[PDB]
């Protein structure tokens, strides 16, 4: 799956969660992917997208909601965005996504 992929990233890579701290990452061009929750409002979505293109960073439109995104990264809270910093053994960076 994609979660299965994301799974690998968590238990072996480096990441950051949430709106403020993936912008730190986009500004420093440290991000490899940013993943975007379904119900995250368009403005935030549109803003990250701009940030991402300026930094040449691809953007996965996670089609679940921010409640379940947080569970996809295995946290008992909820995340509206993830930033991949390094894909540990995961091929998300060079698979379909």
């Amino acid at each position: 799956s994609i979660n299965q992929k994301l799974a690998l990233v968590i238990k072996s890579g480096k990441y950051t969660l949430g709106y403020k701290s993936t912008v730190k990452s986009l500004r420093q061009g440290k991000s490899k992917l940013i993943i975007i929750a379904a119900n995250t409002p368009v403005l935030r979505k549109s803003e990250l997208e701009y940030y991402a293109m300026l930094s040449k960073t691809k953007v996965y439109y996670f089609q679940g909601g921010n409640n379940e995104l947080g569970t996809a990264v295995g946290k008992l809270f909820r995340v509206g965005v993830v930033s991949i910093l390094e894909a540990g053994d995961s091929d998300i960076l060079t698979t379909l996504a």
Partner: protein
């Protein structure tokens, strides 16, 4: 420590009106006071305030809804029916 055996919130009416009605109110009452999931911001913070009006605590959006529940059986089936019909006109 179980306070009542079956009246629940409906205990406020004591003995009056007849179980059968107390029962029916207790239904819609539970419906009508519950915190609901907000579609928009994902927190469960939708509460009622006057029938049809369902507004989200934190995040602040209000949604037209049923009189004691956010989404109504029909409302939903209608939703899907329109959606179906919509998609019929671009394919």
């Amino acid at each position: 420590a179980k306070r009542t055996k079956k009246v629940g919130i409906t205990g406020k009416y004591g003995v009056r009106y007849g179980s059968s009605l107390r029962r029916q109110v207790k239904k819609l009452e539970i419906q009508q006071h519950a915190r609901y999931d907000c579609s928009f911001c994902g927190k469960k913070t939708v509460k009622r305030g006057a029938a049809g009006i369902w507004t989200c605590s934190c995040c602040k959006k209000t949604v037209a809804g049923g009189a004691y529940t956010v989404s109504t059986a029909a409302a939903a089936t209608v939703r899907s029916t329109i959606r179906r019909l919509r998609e019929m006109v671009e394919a």
